[PDB]
Amino acid sequence: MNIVENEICIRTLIDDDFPLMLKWLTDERVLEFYGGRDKKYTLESLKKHYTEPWEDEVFRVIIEYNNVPIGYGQIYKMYDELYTDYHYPKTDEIVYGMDQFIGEPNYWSKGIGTRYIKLIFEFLKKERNANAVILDPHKNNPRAIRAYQKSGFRIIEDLPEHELHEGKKEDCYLMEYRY
Ligand SMILES: CC(C)(COP(=O)(O)OP(=O)(O)OC[C@H]1O[C@@H](n2cnc3c(N)ncnc32)[C@H](O)[C@@H]1OP(=O)(O)O)[C@@H](O)C(=O)NCCC(=O)NCCS(=O)O
Ligand SMILES: NC[C@H]1O[C@H](O[C@H]2[C@H](O)[C@@H](O[C@H]3O[C@H](CO)[C@@H](O)[C@H](N)[C@H]3O)[C@H](N)C[C@@H]2N)[C@H](O)[C@@H](O)[C@@H]1O
């Protein structure tokens, strides 16, 4: 995948990206909201994690802003494990999920995440005929939730004790965008 829209480039993750990703995912500012501050990656263990295979389609991408890599996304075709855990019914609809972080905190709350999401929405519509996109943020991450609401996602389910984060199972929302 490769998308360019003025300041933003979204492109496929390659092995050369992992040292900078290690910087992001050893940064306690970033880890508070993605992964958890108790994660202890090395370059090798991070690469192992981010090269684990997926049952169905996945896009792993790097987000660049003004020619500097600043974050990471993964965009994945929905699969049975997640349909089940989300209590989100499998239908004839084409559904994707997406996880992402901006690893440069100076680029938070400047609208870049919302620009990124909308570019992915457009890609999935034209390239995959997607009908819905879903994700599952922590209830106590309002910056993410508000970005997702700006982008068109709506809360559709409560997911109690959904995700272990820093030793505690955090309540989440299931949020859905339907074009
Ligand atoms: C979640 C992001 C990708 C969102 O992208 P970002 O570019 O920051 O979002 P945005 O388009 O600026 O929208 C954020 C909105 O929330 C607002 N906001 C910031 N902090 C807030 C808070 N504590 N409470 C409520 N709103 C807040 C912010 O001002 C902005 O609103 P606007 O000023 O545009 O009206 C990014 O903040 C990020 O990477 N954060 C750290 C990692 C992370 O949380 N990843 C997602 C995990 S979640 O499980 O999906
Ligand atoms: N709300 C978004 C959340 O996104 C991540 O968590 C997600 C993991 O990334 C997924 O893991 C997949 O991606 C890994 C990296 O490619 C692979 O190793 C692994 N085999 C894959 O299944 C897992 N399935 C769901 C989990 N919620 C963050 O850590 C978490 O903080 C944040 O809240």
Swiss-Prot record:
It comes from the Bacteria. It is found in: Cytoplasm. Residues 110-153 are annotated as: Acetyl-CoA binding site. Residues 8-179 form the N-acetyltransferase domain. In the C-terminal section; belongs to the aminoglycoside phosphotransferase family. Involved in resistance to gentamicin, tobramycin, and kanamycin. Tobramycin and kanamycin resistance is due to the ACC activity, specified by N-terminal region. The C-terminal region is a kinase that phosphorylates several 4,6-disubstituted aminoglycosides. This is Bifunctional AAC/APH. The lineage of its organism: Bacteria, Bacillati, Bacillota, Bacilli, Bacillales. The gene is aacA-aphD. The chain holds residues 1 to 179 of 479 of the full protein.
